[PDB]
């Protein structure tokens, strides 16, 4: 039960089980320990697969735009400030909001 929910890479493959190395924290020191788990208790973690898709695209966007020489934003970059814009009301003033009078519902 202490590995339930944990990820780890594969190092062995037997007929219907898979040796797999995970980390397990114990009173401090983290021990990289290898367990034998039959396949029914295992999935492919797409945690890896966001990258290898940013990779296949980065390697592609670098091979191209190299015949141009134009440097492209390859690195990710966190959500920036939201970049001053306009708002347009067309022919209405905004709707007036008022806090509504309390009444005991029960």
């Amino acid at each position: 039960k202490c590995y339930h929910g944990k990820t780890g890479r594969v190092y062995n493959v037997t007929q219907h089980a898979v040796g797999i190395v995970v980390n397990k924290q114990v009173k401090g020191k983290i021990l990289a320990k290898r367990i034998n788990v039959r396949i029914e208790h295992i999935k492919h973690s797409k945690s890896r697969d966001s990258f290898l898709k940013r990779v296949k695209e980065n390697d592609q966007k670098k091979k191209e735009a190299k015949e141009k020489g134009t440097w492209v934003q390859l690195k990710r970059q966190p959500a920036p400030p939201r970049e001053a814009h306009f708002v347009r009301t067309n022919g209405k003033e905004p709707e007036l909001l008022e806090p509504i009078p309390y009444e005991f519902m029960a």
Binding site: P78, A79, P80, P81, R82, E83, A84, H85, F86, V87, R88, T89, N90, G91
Partner: protein, 225 residues
């Protein structure tokens, strides 16, 4: 020999009075650019709100990109996760301050230490005051006073930053080098706030002093320089 060396060194003497002139003039005119930009940026933000107001229309100015964070409570009885952040913003000692670049990850690190800090959006004069009067540069892991700008070029020259005034570009207009600019700046050590705070414990919005105060932080930087 003698008057073939005498000339050889005198040439190397003047070849500097060329360079330290050309370097002095380049700084001078880079400082004219940063006069025109900082004026066009002020105006053209007024230029625009004036133009939306003419129509039945509105303006939302840009989300501030630069926020200057001060720590306002000391160090004891401070949470684990709090203490990690505050040493990533480099607000180690109480009552010092650093320029943090606003960003989805940065903003979500100020939320988590809000009861300890007091941050807001600095204006130009607030940037100058901090950089000149209380601006020390990290050179060879030392707090060395920024007395002459051959100390700024000696550290940042690989980024087009060459003078005290070029530092302030990269600090105002967040720019490509904010990472190296605002990490050679040693954390600003500001005095106590002349006139006192309101309530160090509680948040600004409930009459206190903590957390974010958009643009009202400049009054706090006067009384604390």
């Amino acid at each position: 020999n003698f008057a073939e060396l005498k000339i050889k060194r005198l040439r190397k003497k003047f070849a500097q009075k060329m360079l330290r002139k050309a370097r002095r003039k380049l700084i001078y005119e880079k400082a004219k650019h940063y006069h025109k930009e900082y004026r066009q940026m002020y105006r053209t933000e007024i230029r625009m709100a004036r133009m939306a107001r003419k129509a039945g229309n509105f303006y939302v100015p840009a989300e501030p990109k630069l926020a200057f964070v001060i720590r306002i409570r000391g160090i004891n009885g401070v949470s684990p996760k709090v203490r990690k952040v505050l040493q990533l913003l480099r607000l180690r000692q109480i009552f010092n301050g650093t320029f943090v670049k606003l960003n989805k990850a940065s903003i979500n690190m100020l939320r988590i230490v809000e009861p300890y800090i007091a941050w807001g959006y600095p204006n130009l004069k607030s940037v100058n005051e901090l950089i000149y009067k209380r601006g020390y540069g990290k050179i060879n892991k030392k707090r060395i006073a920024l007395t002459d700008n051959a100390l700024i070029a000696r550290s940042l020259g690989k980024y087009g930053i060459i003078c005290m005034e070029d530092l302030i570009h990269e600090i105002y207009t967040v720019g490509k080098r904010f990472k190296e600019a605002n990490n050679f700046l040693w954390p600003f050590k500001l005095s106590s706030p002349r006139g006192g705070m309101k309530k160090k414990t509680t948040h600004f919005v409930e009459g206190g002093d903590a957390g974010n105060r958009e643009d009202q932080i400049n009054r706090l930087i006067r009384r604390m320089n």
